[model samples]
Target chain A: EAIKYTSSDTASHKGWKATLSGTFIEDPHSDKKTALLNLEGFIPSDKQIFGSKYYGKMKWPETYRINVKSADVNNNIKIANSIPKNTIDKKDVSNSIGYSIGGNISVEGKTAGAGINASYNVQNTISYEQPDFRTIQRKDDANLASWDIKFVETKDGYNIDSYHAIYGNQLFMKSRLYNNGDKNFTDDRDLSTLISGGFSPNMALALTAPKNAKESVIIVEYQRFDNDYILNWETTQWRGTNKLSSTSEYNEFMFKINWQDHKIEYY
Target chain B: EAIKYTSSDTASHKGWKATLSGTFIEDPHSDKKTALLNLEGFIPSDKQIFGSKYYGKMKWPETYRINVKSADVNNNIKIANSIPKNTIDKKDVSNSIGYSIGGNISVEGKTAGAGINASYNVQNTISYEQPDFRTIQRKDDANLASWDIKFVETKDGYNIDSYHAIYGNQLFMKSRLYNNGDKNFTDDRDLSTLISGGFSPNMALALTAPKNAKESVIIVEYQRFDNDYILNWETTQWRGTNKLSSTSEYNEFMFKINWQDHKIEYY
Candidate 1:
């Protein structure tokens, strides 16, 4: 069985209200965990004031935490191996005259925790066929995908006994367990060296916890370019002792832009 | 050692003359056979009449014919396995306004012959910052890469006794020989099934020959989409008895466009 959640909200920028919706799914047995974010709405009628140039960027940051018995933290919990299923949707257009839609998503994990994030940018311009350009209008929409993290039980408590990161089809990155002896142990691979003309990879750090607590958290910060636009975001999630599932959620964000300035804010 | 050839020409349509230049290289030992085509010139000043929309497509069709002895045709000549080196150049721009540049290339082969093709589309528009939009100008240049096809000598004649197509890093597609029993034996693979969001593959057909002749020929016709523009071209190459080396060449073409009609013609 899989746990799922859906949420909807509205964001206003430059006199236009855009609808924001997201669906988050967490499956323990299957490797198809995902978070899909969608945005759609009309551009301002007076957008012509900008003269055929209207576009901005959007970013989403997420995190996961796992709660586990202190004794099981070093019990050699492993990261399971799985195939990479990350993908980008084909670009969609409504009128085919300056309207565009698309998005990107990826996922990675560690023994104690993991994170999934999605980001996209939008650029709309008035149709060149229009004569006056006074009534400028455009609609945009996009979606994304992530990976699943499964937990199993041991004598001490539930543990992520197996885990791996799938970068491409059958291309797996083995997860390295943390040795409390050092601050942390990390295994990293740059995707650019693996694929031709590639993009940067998101990081999945080791777990962290407070003294004598059942909960451990992992925090990942990421920065990358999406369609020529720079995007930045963070993720936080955790699991609890004796628990096999963790909680996941998305914070809604908005992008507002004008000729002079561009702004993004979380609501 | 590698054989190289460079050629230059000029094309005109709608009162604008554009310079065309290309570099073609053939290397038997090295796996870096390449053909780079470049286009550079000013957009028509009157391009503003088209209202920020000036773009067209270009296609290059190439063929390689190897001359070999007839007895060696069934000697199981193989395609040497090499990494997939096909790629697209990053978009380049000058003055950051509306000028754009880029291109795509790929290569594939069979025991008797092979074909390498490159296609690119250009979309240039006038800068929006100008108040009058009367003076429209843009510059463009791009390059491409293809795999090397090597031939070795057998007891009877030269044969491609060992050849494999490399789709990606270490991803090899084994070459199969043509059994004279059938019209042709094709081992075909669609890239879309292997990679996420991939383009169509070019064909390298089995060799054909005239009765009692030392020369064998392969003809491949291809159609594909380059930057949303439909492109079509053909390749014809042949191999002769007792010959180890093959002859390869590119047929130059031009694209002419106006609001009402778009035409592409080989010169």
Candidate 2:
């Protein structure tokens, strides 16, 4: 009854919830701070440029994302002989999503921006009869959950723009198929939503590998102001007279989920 | 000791960390069995739309946005009359960067997507985007949040676009005399950086209300996907997607503060 996956594919699970119970220690990397690229000319379209004066004193949250290197809660994540380095990007996450795609891992996808809520909201605009717009963006992980999971904050390379996690057989697909358009499965953006509204990559996997208590961590890197959703009060807008506020000067945590993974015995 | 506003303009603080529980009972004036709306367009911007389908019945998750007029809460809210109506939008939540903003009841921005974080994020976009992108789009309160906390198995509303807890103050400002900028006392967004995060109509009144909880039941909406920000996520290729699937669906929740004369207080 001891759920076990041998030398086969190490990324194996028998409905086990991997709970990451630890305080966030350090940034995943020591370099790359919040995804603040030099976006001047392309000033985001949906929002305005508050200039350095405002941004000069803003706070960026922590971030977290992971690509399955290998798993087998029953066994230690089996890699070949020695511990090899695994740096997977958005392109490398395909092996994680298929309903039946094997290997210990069952799900994967690209996550960027700030965190799971993926603060990578970028934009540009033009004025005409209506307004014309265009741009690119992504959301992956954030800080609060990092702290909750005990994952150290990361600065540079120790990050995950493309992250993925998996669950057991049909459970993962049922929820997915519940959302998928005829199960025709498109790509990552589609997959992210499945996990957004309380779906557990870990829970799904935990069902398949429940024995090893595990968890799923998704942090949303948002501007501090994103917290307005929770606050009970509104800020002042004018001194003598001038309405202007809700600028993206702050960020907030979107809460975390801990799904326990349990592996059942064949009996 | 309890906090009271005495119908006068005197404010106080109840401090942080508390939960307010309540539910939507009914809306006598309803057009359909259920309804959905996006509040952003109410302000003005060719920018974002929360979803694609008008009724929201695509591959997206099954959700609903209801307007609860007669709220009925079983649990005793600690703040009591602090929140006159004791009604809240799911989005009226608060999150933190390094610091957690877990104040009693939600701050206001939990659902609609507003507020700020500390030292983590930088003010790069949205601060001046949507409103600046175009004139504010205005709309009368359709009173969508007027349904009992009902649950429909299928798609009644793709995430009730209602729950505009702080609709009145969704857009406002605050400023201080900064010795550095030429625009002294003119940098509201600048000050937004210092802001940890916030809510809407109530958030505005909370900071400006000489009387604490003066305008407790303002009209700000909740769980805003922040339509404008989602410009980056709109799909170019059309499918049988619902309108709520797009970023446009986020605008359904928004309104001016319909402050009623009630017993106010400052905790």
Candidate 3:
């Protein structure tokens, strides 16, 4: 026997919106159950004005979160995927001014009682100025931080399929289940090493769930960086009566996620 | 008469360092003056670990500033250049572990008494995850914001030479003084239009100084963006008992700079 269920919802914020849909399927002949979730949205447009200049800034959601919870069908719930796809479009209205649009979508699966949770933290800025006569400078910085986890079902017992996490501009850790040839495997060493190195504190707890319990746990975290700074002048000017000088310092973003009793905690 | 002045300094931070040096020359016989400012530094190493996986994040200075003030020689002081050059390096130690290094340098010019001021805001990150059974997810987003200004002495009168500015991922506006066919010129229309459009508030105030002032003013500003996000899974998984999904929203950054009198203001 086979059965199915479906649901949908949409969310809107300052300058952007999100649409989410879910589907569940159960089959008795294969002794398996599947849950599907889909999400999509467009990023907002950002703008800045200088004297007579109009500057368009790329915009992103300050924070984005998604959760999919299924009823316990036995500890056999497993995740099929959890990757997101992105698209970007830019149109030049004038030589000195233009606008851009960004869009993204992702889909994933889990058991009835197993759950999937994901969150994102973003920071961005664009600016320009002349600091002195002998120096012309410009700097741009954009960053994002994220955390995610999933629970899965295995043939022999309950098991975790993935774990991805990122803090600020660094990739904290990432793991996944893949079939190489005929054997199913997950990247476990890299995850263990990162935790042992103290780069990720208390992360080992995410790997200690029962293999045949009513619920299994999976975790995923991700991050990325794009930054640029410039200071230019005529080479000859450096040898003239004028003077120039510059200084730089590193900056960091911070956030935390914890797991306890088959649940996730964030701050 | 030929005159020269030289200065040097080094700045050290948590995981990085910077070295700056300056040289100034004056030659009355040629009716010429030169200022040389050399800045060099290595960006710190960023890192993250997941279980046994180690991911390296690209790192950059959070905030960088430069200023060059010169004595008023006449309304003849002008800028030579203002574009910063960048360098990047990456080394892989294993299939799942690696690190990276970044470096940059820039030079510019102006007349005496005319001041140069520059500032930078940077953001960066790297991350990976698997949120569900049929899906594998990874997202990377990087961005930068910058502002700069420069004042020069024109042969005709006290005039501004260079103006480069950016808000975030979008290029707000960029203008420079180029000698096309022996005729010296600057981008005046784009600057006027951006201000006229109200994109830049109170920017015209910067263009009001004298064409022949002992203390003329010049301004420069710049911005850039680099971002990526991905969500993937086995084609069969998307149609199987497993399900996959993903979502995305745009993020943004903000800052401000002001000019009053012959000096600059920041917040």
Candidate 4:
């Protein structure tokens, strides 16, 4: 599905190239500060599929990647991680969307380190709860506001401007569609395989992407094992009803989304 | 020396209070997913006289004052010690301003030890820098265009903004600051004192600080043999025009600052 940044002007951004590069923050211990640690997007949610929903009857794992979502310091960022409740923020998250993608299998006996190379596309529509504090008049302190569709950021829009793939307990490979004019998304032939030292037969093809000011959209990729990549891309576009107030204002969206990602596993 | 981003045209307006928290990172042996772990900051030309700056320079024995700054990726969002080098993009900073106000100082013997009560302010137009490509911006493509400041931020833009205090090889007491209206020009009074159990009362404080936000600033105080809070402040604001567009785009910024910092120790 496609996400529009505005309701009145559903016309997608003419050319939204990645102004920022992709990175996987590896273990800060080993990965120096600000270094590209790894890439992510590897998960196997397809196994539980039964023609429709793979997550329906399946009791989710204690930590499933599909559950990751953006959280605010207010009451909206509620997640069920069972960690100390202090881990989640209690503030209102005006700009964020969380999604987790996981499922690991041993590779040729030794468990493959966390490095995603899979790809995916969300199939279901996501949801958001617009309270009353949506619009803003002016002031250092906020007083009169509505959490309605006026503040259509969290609830109404869809379209991931940023994304990251995970493995090794952290995001290893990540790819964000800075600009997707169409719903069909393809990775940069992911470099995940190159990262893990294992040869990915298809790693030779260079990525075909849009470029902004830099030489090209500074994109990074991670190869998946299933003739695909791990931590595959699974996103929802922002779909909103109201026209975004301004380009900077949080408007347009893709509500709820579902996905049935697939990949091959070698036991 | 003030940075005011208040625009007359407020859109979905919400005033953003910028805080520059201070921090003293603890080296975690087991896990540290987020930190300037592979730290890259100005190696102050010499050692400092205060506990904070002294801890970094003197490399003295020290205690934990609530660990103002820690690294935990689980938190996902960590405050930084410096501002974004918005202009220099992938460059290192050369100078910055830092300051310290109220501190509680105690000591061991003739030297400062655990259990102290006192506070000092450090001000400096200090400079800092990392090796050309030795910084993460060089090695990790992932860290491109991204920067993290390491101060334990407060809602009021105070605490841990700049610290040249943790330089002593070892000192007692953990100090923090308060938030003020003037981020770059005003001073704050927020102190955390530790009494009765931890340090000695023979340490001294330095009165040094950076000239401006573009320079390094620090504030310190220590105990004299007679147990007086011998305090002073320092500023490196003497240097010529510190700017990127001007003489030089700020090469001496906190995230990428460098310069010679002095210390006054007579124990």
Q: Estimate TM-scores for all models.
A: 0.17, 0.17, 0.19, 0.15
Number of colliding residue pairs in model 4 = 205
Model 1 per-residue lDDT tens digits across residues A115-173: 23333323332222211101100100010112211111222221222211221111111
Cα shift from native, residue A33, model 2 (Å): 32
For each candidate in the order shown, give its overall lDDT on alpha carbons. 0.22, 0.19, 0.23, 0.18
Model 2 chain B weakest 10-residue run by lDDT: B75-84
lDDT of 2 by residue, B1-267 (tens): 222222322221222111112221112221101111122211111221233321111122222132212111221111111111211011111112222221111122223233333223222111111111111111111111211111111111212222122221111111121122122111234322111122222211111111121232323332222211111112331112122334523222212221234332222
Model 4: per-residue lDDT, tens digit, A1-267?
A: 211111111112222111111222122121111111111223221211111211011111111111112112221111111111101001111122223333332222222333323333322222222221122111111111111011111122321111222211111122232332222222225322222222211101111111111121111111121111122223442111111112121212111111111111111
Rank order by lDDT, top first?
3, 1, 2, 4
Worst 10 residues of 1 chain B by lDDT: B44-53
Model 2 bad stretches (over 4 Å):
A1-131, A138-213, A224-247, A261-267, B1-72, B75-267
lDDT at residue A187 of model 1 (Cα atoms): 20
Q: Comparing candidate 1 with candidate 4, which one achieves the higher TM-score? A: 1
For candidate 4, give the docking quality class from DockQ: incorrect
Estimate, for each residue in B1-267, the C-alpha lDDT of model 3 and write its tens digit: 675433323222331222333344444553444444343322211211111111111111111122222223343443444324222423222112222233223323431222222222222332222111111112111111122211112211221222222211111112111112111112222121111111110111111112233333222221111112111112221100111112111112111111111111111
- Estimate the lDDT of model 2: 0.19
Model 3, which residues run further than 4 Å from truth?
A: A52-78, A84-267, B1-267
Runs of candidate 4 with Cα error greater than 4 angstroms are: A1-40, A47-62, A65-88, A91-267, B1-258, B261-267
